[PDB]
Design a protein around this ligand. Structure first.
Ligand SMILES: Nc1nc2c(ncn2[C@@H]2O[C@H](COP(=O)(O)OP(=O)(O)O)[C@@H](O)[C@H]2O)c(=O)[nH]1
Ligand SMILES: [Mg+2]
Length: 175
């Protein structure tokens, strides 16, 4: 059957690269599509075939009025945040969880930390330290996942593809 999965989260957390890296097995290097689109994947999981529909969204505030038009008939949401952006992590509960629950009270949510490959990057750490900030640790994300009652907390990197298949694998299992 068909599953509708919608991806939301701050601008430049990597939502488009997340979707493109998953469906093509390739990270787009300077070639990131600018057209907001929905993608697809036919996958085998636990025995049955599945048509997973993936809906990208514009995460900037300029789209707050239009973005929810993609929400009807959603089966599962992915709320994304950059593991190396505390502001994006904060916006999970400041913006994204409220907005999702406001329109879709009972749809399961998957909390996804993105850009896992940057959590150990010396330059990213030092730049964050200039703001007295630190990358989001796994226990941090887990706790956030439990605060908003997400069915699962998962971390991934669209660049290395580490932990990327699990994200969409678990979003199907959530449905
Ligand atoms: N290092 C790293 N950079 C990433 C990753 N995913 C996305 N990016 C970068 O983050 C930027 C925004 O990605 P994009 O998918 O457009 O985010 P969106 O605005 O949420 O769609 C791009 O400049 C990518 O180079 C990742 O897993 N690792
Ligand atoms: Mg995008």
């Amino acid at each position: 059957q068909a599953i509708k999965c919608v991806v939301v989260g701050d601008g430049a957390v990597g939502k488009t690269c997340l979707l493109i890296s998953y469906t093509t097995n390739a990270f787009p290097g300077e070639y990131i599509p600018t057209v907001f689109d929905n993608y697809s994947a036919n996958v085998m999981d636990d025995g049955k075939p599945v048509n997973l529909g993936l809906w990208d969204t514009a995460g900037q505030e300029d789209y707050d009025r239009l973005r929810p038009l993609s929400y009807p008939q959603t089966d599962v949401f992915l709320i994304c945040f950059s593991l190396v952006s505390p502001a994006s992590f904060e916006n999970v509960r400041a913006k994204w969880y409220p907005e999702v629950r406001h329109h879709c009270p009972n749809t399961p949510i998957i909390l996804v930390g993105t850009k896992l490959d940057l959590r150990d990057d010396k330059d990213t750490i030092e730049k964050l330290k200039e703001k007295k900030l630190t990358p989001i640790t796994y226990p941090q994300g887990l706790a956030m996942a439990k605060e908003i009652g997400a069915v699962k907390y998962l971390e991934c990197s669209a660049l290395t593809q580490r932990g990327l298949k699990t994200v969409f694998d678990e979003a199907i299992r959530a449905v």
